[PDB]
Amino acid sequence: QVQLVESGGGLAQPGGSLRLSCEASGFGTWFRFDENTVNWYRQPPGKSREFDELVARYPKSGIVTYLDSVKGRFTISRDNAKKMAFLQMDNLKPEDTAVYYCNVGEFWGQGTQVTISSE
Amino acid sequence: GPMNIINTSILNLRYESNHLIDLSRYASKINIGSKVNFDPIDKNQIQLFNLESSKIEVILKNAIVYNSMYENFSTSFWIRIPKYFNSISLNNEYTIINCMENNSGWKVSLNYGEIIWTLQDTQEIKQRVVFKYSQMINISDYINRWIFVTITNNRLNNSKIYINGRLIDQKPISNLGNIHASNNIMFKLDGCRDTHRYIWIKYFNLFDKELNEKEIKDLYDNQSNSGILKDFWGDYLQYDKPYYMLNLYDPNKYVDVNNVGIRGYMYLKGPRGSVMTTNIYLNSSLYRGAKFIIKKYNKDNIVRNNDRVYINVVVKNKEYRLATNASQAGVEKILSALEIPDVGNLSQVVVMKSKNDQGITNKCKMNLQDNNGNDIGFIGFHQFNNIAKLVASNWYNRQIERSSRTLGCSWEFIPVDDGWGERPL
């Protein structure tokens, strides 16, 4: 009866931008959102989840790390009172096409498709 | 407190009165970059990232800059290394502690499943000593868990690496001539291709002699801080923190509840299941089963040896109380998850244990008692027909004394940690 629900993905053009969002709901009082790390992962097209890439990580320490290919283009953030996480994705490239997942602690969103259409 | 050999060590990097400094007689200067994380619960625990400003530099006093053909020396520290999860880490040796400059000196480096010591003279004669650990393993003693590293160097014979107070490997260094190390020591991930890689490190020391095995074992015991309970990763066990349970006697099961209330019971359910990334890791899933939460019966949230406690259990997003009716003939007392307001006169107070009165350590963590300090028994399990029900039993208490071996009452508390990520099952 707990869930991570993702939104904000879909289709975009190269050079364009999207913002993914993720919301943690239903969690009992034992669950402290502020104590949990928020991650965004993505699954490369044509590969299984074993090929998942860690796109961005925002731990409680606040020291953020990014996948090399998205440095300077993507920005991760979090809202502890709203129990939300965000992935701002700028200057998109065809190779950014993937299913993206929000991960908070040991909990996961279902995945959101992002598709970047070339010219 | 700290051992004499620590108090007289030539570099003794510790957190003191709100800063990380050298406690040695030499008081070497420490420069700390802007992206170094100090664990708020235990500020001696230092996290270093794959970022340029995540570094600590020691400016060695001239008197202890290594320049010799004969002087023996050693280093000790604890390290916690997150599980490798990207194929980019497979064949990627990266330095983490650097005292190698202009082709001579020493360094500690890491690679996939490896801790490496490198020593080199001014003629560039080199020796390497390595500790290897696997990521293809059900339950690892090493992956993402605090381990104690000790490296000793005897200029007339061998360099040795120890892990957790025990000798792993050794290699001859007697062919090495003059070793002239760096004027500085840089703690920094250097040449790591995994942009998310980090390490935790604590209690770094340098010694101007070859530590013997007794000294190393003593350092290990002392720095283990055995009066404080630990979680699976080796951090301090805490109150009000969700832990997944792992029974060391039967690791291939997780804790579940058939039904809540005194008519239901806690049991180990299997199989636990695995997590895998081909060619990178294959392990038991750790984040499984009903979470235990440790509840106060000191204001710092750290769980200490002999602390009396209640155990809460999370079932279907709700907290319940571990309890039992101990008034029956059977020595094994089946544990149930009760509605907290409805526990009544049932037995529920648990004494947390890390070691006994003589200082001997044991993995049996939970000794259930009545309300007047009388033993009911350590919490473990017992097979009833086909069902491994959670149980409190004084048989355990009698076994703890005679032998040091793993028992049904041996548990690990596993909190969710950045160095061990699992895809959802």
Residue numbers in the entry:
A (entry chain B): 1 to 119
B (entry chain A): 869 to 1165, 1169 to 1296
What did the article's authors report about this structure?
In order to understand the molecular details underlying BoNT/A1 neutralization by ciA-C2, we performed co-crystallization and determined the structure of ciA-C2 in complex with HCA1 at 1.68 Å resolution. Interestingly, ciA-C2 binds to HCA1 at an area located between HCNA1 and HCCA1. Residues G26, G28, W30, and T37 of CDR1 form multiple hydrogen bonds with N1188 and D1289 in HCCA1. A structural comparison between the HCA1-ciA-C2 and HCA1-gSV2C complexes showed that ciA-C2 largely occupies the binding-site for the SV2C glycan. Therefore, ciA-C2 simultaneously inhibits both the protein- and glycan-based interactions between BoNT/A1 and SV2C.
The extreme toxicity of BoNT/A1 depends to a large degree on its highly specific recognition of motoneurons in NMJs by HCA114–19. In this study, we focused on an alpaca VHH (named ciA-C2) that potently neutralizes BoNT/A1, one of the eight known BoNT/A subtypes (A1-A8).
